[PDB]
């Protein structure tokens, strides 16, 4: 044929079956648009930022009247099953169908499907699941055969398939994705585009933001994820938060998919994540949404105003600039740098909201090795984005916000830093609460609490040493049975700690009715748990405070110890130099039956003598003093050596600063020996001092203060939403 | 031309200059043998064990009367300078020249050079230093041009050059290797053979033992390293130990090359290694030689009787057999498995001798990162060979030794295991000696020794934590300035420890003349240092007890802590799975000026419909219950996961067992708290207990007992040698 100005663009038909199905939808089979009968394949052979320059287009811009996209739903996928992708697509099509049935809308209506463009971006053709390709092909958005690797000695970077389908998923069973095309389906503009090389997930967003977003010029860019099924109208509810111009990015609630009839609650790891997510979306997102800066907008379900992110925010997201600390480690916070650069944008008053009435059930890990590896990225990004946000807090005052909002933002950044400092010292805080609570009960009532205080300290020491060693030089999949054992041991430690607290609390009552432990029950059961329960109730979602709350408590020591140790030990995912330099090729010999071969060799006396003199002048012009500089590292081998140095100086600084607090409260590290020796000069060490009780009270009142601030934030969020509801009635 | 039975063999001439030089040597230029005028190049394209089978030969077997090789000197080299190789070659040619001038010999004489075959084996052609190639080419054993990469679609495994040279090195300056050919030179049968691929060092010995040793059938095989210059007659003295049939392997003294006028003694790291080597060859080699089993025969200078190692010992050395502990990890002890399998050989009474009068100065690391990486292999091999030797000690009694020697060997194995147990607990032993000595001086005399006991404990804790973290997840070359700082800090700790010992020793004397510390001076200065001095003196080599003995003491804490921590943290040199699976190739498009290209595409309704149904039956026959088993690891990624599990279970077991002793002597780990709490039940902790003094005395009397056993062994060795000297007068 002929290509489209240096671009391979083939406009092929779909199939007889799909055409018949689509024709059943319309009242007249003759009047079927030109978008449902074809599937335009393009071979993009350039960078995403050069898409418009290299004359690559999409089908939305080639209509007689160009379509103005209002939502660009972006579904990043990689090796996900057809059930995970089908679950995400069913939510999108339910949202589009809901957004078409609306009547009292100035944006949505009978022709609302032309404003949404669904853009599935798979990460590598070699890694995509064949069942996912089968599902996309059954939707009319993928045909086998047109996947050319190279176009005019230019490698193809992406294969872009686009087809406005009429097929909608209507049911996702455990093994079946039901695809009906009746009179009650809506068209979906599919733009499934899969890469050739697996260039991670940030590059998928680079393709969706610097690439197709530039051509589409959408208003909002909702970033879904493969496996994350939004609600019946959650994307529409998330889009409703952009009615006021100030919002330049919003996020919804992400729930946990508990399976058929809540079957996954039996898994203690899934139930713990359920409660953690519910608390994150009741106390963290609601509190941060009041100030106007949400720490992370989840990549699984979030929406950005395109105008808000275009420019400096996306510039630091993708490139972000030597080996400097804030420029070489900025990639740890993948999409958390996109939230800080939008709120703190020069001459722009952007804020981030959290939509309570827009949910999206996701798929969470069910196994410890898969759960630990996920939270390493989460913890590393959250730590590196909090350090970046606090250090660059002066950029709030260089933005276009008013003074009233700037003050709230700088108050929130201090609170976020205080939370970061609490989470940094959690390794020492848990050990000190455990060690003070199990020693102060062995002094008060002795009996078997004596040897139990030594058994559980040694068990802690062994489980923490082994976690440090298995995290620095071993993989979680290598040792799955030990990480589960460590989680079980820390759960036993938490059970013992709770028992000790209840015992010393009931004994204090029976001593008064017939102190550090007297106010220990109005600090962690009445001021902390009751506030969580009330916050969950006022959120109108209290059913997780009993279904999945014990598994969270029993697994919290694993969150503090196993999870943070592994996150801090694998900061940078090192690989070390692996090049394998190759020598210059030499000649070839291919003998015959008798073995005679060509003669092109050197036998001449002069020719041999010249080589001998060449090897004789090398020995004669060595010149040791002017020794050539030893070959210095490359960049990938020099850059790994810096990531290793940053990684190790973080573990050392995090272990030493946590131990300094343990060395001050419990007087370990020779501190007690030194104090006793001074008294000798002017010979015994006390077991428990007065610093231990003061620290215990302080570290359990900080937990109550954080819960109280989070409760106040949640209440303010709910009250403001209720007032915006009573005024829009 | 024509090849030699499927083998590329070219018999080229050398050069006009070399022929003239050789002709100057002979009285008549016409009567020059055929071996000095040619250089037979061969292209070996097979495994070393198939060398004879695939009709590959050497020049000694093609004479009219085949030459019987008596010594096969094997010089393994890899990327070494031309000075390092020239230094090794000068010693070999001095030895050959010494072995020709002998007259009262039934093996050596005017034609003794026909029995020695020097076999240089370089490890990779891409890595060999071009100046080393220049030096070999100037010796007439390498010509550029004949290095074919493949012979009849069969990759060339080695390029074998062989030429009996007449050129001898007579002086090695800092940058010049003097090559004269006068009337006082001896021929050297060179067999320089370099590989194509860098297959490590064990494969070089596989080529030298299963390969050219099979063809040559030598009596002795001396293993040198490029850079190790033997003495004027050290190889002859080493060969002289094989006169008695019992010896099936011998080794000489390895010294340190201190440079021109002992310039390298300024380096404290070189001076420390000097003393360590001196003591190793005065107290370890001499003591072990009496029993008849030397723990390691150094790869830099050792000799094996060919018939002694030929068979089961070499089979274990090279292949040595699942993931079993003694079969998967036995490669850690590279050549230490060759020593144990020779002494404990079925129906063979082989013993290993140590030759005092055969030395070889070597090149030692001058920088901390290079010194740490070398000693990792040494420590790991010595630990894995001691565990193997002790566990398989029953194989001594299944060998052909007599009962008297079997009893001596089983007595030696228990002593070697006791030394291994001491070196395993050195991490705790040093800390306990340091902590007991700096606390017991702060109680006795207070003053500034109080805060110094806490500063130095915290300094130790920081330097040990940082060494553990920098060893598990960082490379020594990445952090060179920190390892030097850690060595300096441990040297300061040793200076303080020595000061504390001297202080408390002089105070005890001034208290008695006007106890754990009273006998502290007759345990570590009179029973340990005096025995070292006397052993060095009776060895007739005492000059290192003063030149390089302070730098050894100041660097011993680094040997105990930095060196062992790094060795135990990097047991297996992991790399983790790095494969990068590739997808199937797709089509190609090459457009023309107008962009028209060939049409071989699918447009047919049936052909598209068949693909659509193919992607519709994949979505229809998912069958989740009969789910395909998840793709299990390969072998290189499954074998790394086992080396990681063995590596981590060694660090955990080595840290926990060392801390148990610290938890028993100092009562840390809640032991003191638990002891005080029992007294509460029937409230203060003592600073120093009576267990600390008992352990201090025990751990400093074990040091004296080991030194006494080593002194007795050295004295017996010297006395036996003196009696063998007075009888052979
Ligand atoms: C020999 C075994 C080696 C094991 C190595 C494990 C891996 C990494 C490095 C660990 C560094 C500490 C090594 C062991 C030191 C030790 O067992 O020493 C003890 C405990 O001392 C304490 O407090 C210990 C407190 C816990 C330390 C946590 C890890 C290190 C964090 C940073 C360290 C900073 C400096 C710490 C200095 C101690 C001194 O007990 P004592 O004689 O005072 O008891 C008097 C009772 N009446
Ligand atoms: C919060 C900081 C975490 C740092 C993590 C560093 C890396 C690896 C794991 C280390 C495990 C130990 C964590 C810290 C425990 C600790 O600081 O706890 C202290 C010291 O306790 C002791 O003895 C400590 C002795 C030294 C421990 C050596 C390393 C571990 C060896 C293997 C484990 C063996 C069992 C260890 C049990 C502790 C309890 O002091 P105390 O309240 O009794 O002092 C009463 C004074 N009147
Ligand atoms: C964890 C997340 C979801 N379960 C998930 O796993 N998301 C992946 C990710 O974000 O890493 C997705 O990234 C894409 N991906 C991955 C690898 C690659 O190499 N290339 C590539 O494109 C895939 O779509 C892949 O599913 C969950 O919803 C969630 C819950 C709470 C929260 O606060 C934030 N998120
Ligand atoms: C350390 C040793 C010597 N300084 C040395 O470094 N020997 C290397 C080694 O044994 O590893 C040699 O091995 C060869 N090699 C190396 C890498 C490779 O990839 N391929 C390859 O062939 C090279 O000849 C290389 O010099 C010293 O003499 C000594 C002192 C005391 C003792 O008890 C034992 N040994
Ligand atoms: C979570 C952040 C903790 C920061 C340190 C808190 C404790 C400070 C010492 C308290 C006891 C002081 C006794 C004199
Ligand atoms: C005086 C009574 C002592 C009773 C000791 C009981 C010990 C029980 C075994 C250890 C249990 C450890 C649970 C983690
Ligand atoms: C005199 C009685 C002393 C008892 C000491 C008990 C020490 C127990 C240490 C912790 C062992 C933990 C095993 C997991
Ligand atoms: C006293 C010994 C304690 C051992 C603790 C567990 C160590 C586990 C290390 C990894 C082994 C392989 C697990 C799959
Ligand atoms: C299929 C793997 C399931 C793993 C579930 C979580 C294991 C750890 C449980 C920790 C709590 C134990 C309480 C007794
Ligand atoms: C003062 C009366 C004490 C009676 C004995 C209490 C023993 C408690 C043991 C708890 C074991 C389970 C811990 C998780
Ligand atoms: C909050 C903790 C920060 C820890 C890292 C600080 C910066 C480290 C930079 C290391 C550079 C090493 C260059 C060789
Ligand atoms: C960063 C280097 C180590 C710093 C250690 C600081 C210890 C401070 C102890 C203060 C006294 C605590 C008991 C009153
Ligand atoms: C180097 C090997 C050491 C093995 C342990 C030695 C010490 C044993 C305890 C000594 C003190 C006992 C006090 C009751
Ligand atoms: C009562 C007198 C106290 C003197 C203290 C001296 C401290 C000197 C600084 C720390 C030196 C550390 C050397 C490693
Ligand atoms: C009452 C005075 C207390 C002094 C405490 C000093 C603690 C020192 C800890 C060690 C610091 C080491 C720095 C390298
Ligand atoms: C080249 C070295 C880079 C940094 C590696 C980590 C060294 C950490 C040493 C201790 C720092 C101070 C802790 C208080
Ligand atoms: C070129 C590098 C030389 C390194 C020499 C050794 C450094 C460590 C010395 C330890 C002893 C210091 C005594 C004060
Ligand atoms: C009993 C008199 C004591 C006088 C003060 C002694 C101080 C010693 C300090 C040593 C510093 C250097 C250690 C390496
Ligand atoms: C002397 C110390 C020996 C430590 C290692 C013991 C054997 C460990 C085997 C681990 C196998 C793990 C299989 C998953
Ligand atoms: C391997 C698991 C831990 C074992 C700890 C053993 C501790 C034994 C202590 C014995 C009492 C010491 C003071 C008298
Ligand atoms: C020289 C390159 C920038 C270095 C910035 C260091 C920031 C350290 C922050 C520490 C926070 C506790
Ligand atoms: C951020 C939380 C750090 C750890 C606080 C203590 C956790 C355990 C509390 C147990 C109370 C009985
Ligand atoms: C005086 C009797 C006190 C009994 C306390 C029982 C505490 C049980 C805690 C269970 C936590 C899961
Ligand atoms: C990052 C610093 C952590 C330690 C802070 C100081 C702890 C000691 C305070 C002593 C007060 C008497
Ligand atoms: C099952 C394969 C062989 C396992 C041999 C284990 C030997 C352990 C030795 C431990 C010495 C302390
Ligand atoms: C094998 C040696 C282990 C450590 C023994 C103690 C070393 C320091 C001795 C200091 C004496 C003053
Ligand atoms: C009473 C005075 C004692 C002085 C002790 C000095 C010890 C110096 C040791 C130096 C070791 C390198
Ligand atoms: C490998 C085992 C190391 C510890 C040996 C026992 C230590 C405690 C002995 C207690 C005697 C009272
Ligand atoms: C469904 C998996 C249940 C695991 C329970 C572990 C305690
Ligand atoms: C309207 C903004 C309210 C902020 C409340 C912060 C607690
Ligand atoms: C930019 C690095 C320093 C930040 C200081 C913030 C107060
Ligand atoms: C212009 C920067 C003002 C910072 C105020 C911090 C409270
Ligand atoms: C623009 C919103 C202002 C909120 C109140 C600030 C004090
Ligand atoms: C009273 C001592 C009991 C020891 C129990 C060890 C598990
Ligand atoms: C999934 C691995 C289970 C191990 C259980 C250890 C208690
Ligand atoms: C020749 C190198 C001397 C280094 C001295 C370091 C203390
Ligand atoms: C003749 C064998 C002597 C052995 C002595 C061992 C100490
Ligand atoms: C072969 C593994 C066990 C050895 C026991 C030696 C006593
Ligand atoms: C046949 C094995 C005998 C062992 C004796 C050990 C002393
Ligand atoms: C064969 C040498 C024997 C030495 C004496 C053994 C007791
Ligand atoms: C008397 C306290 C001195 C502290 C010195 C810290 C280095
Ligand atoms: C070779 C690096 C020297 C660092 C010195 C630190 C004291």
UniProtKB/Swiss-Prot annotation, chains A, B:
GO MF annotations in UniProt: chitin synthase activity
Inactivation phenotype: Cell lysis during cytokinesis.
One GO CC annotation: plasma membrane
Cell compartments where the protein resides: Cell membrane
Ranges annotated as spanning the membrane: 413-433, 451-471, 484-504, 521-541, 549-569, 649-669, 699-719
UniProt main location, coarse: membrane
Membrane topology designation: Multi-pass membrane protein
The entry's keywords: Cell membrane, Cell wall biogenesis/degradation, Glycosyltransferase, Membrane, Phosphoprotein, Transferase, Transmembrane, Transmembrane helix
Recorded family membership: Belongs to the chitin synthase family.
Protein name, entry field: Chitin synthase 1
Organism of this sequence: Saccharomyces cerevisiae (strain ATCC 204508 / S288c)
Lineage, top ranks: Eukaryota, Fungi, Dikarya, Ascomycota, Saccharomycotina
Portion of the full-length sequence here: 378 to 1131 of 1131
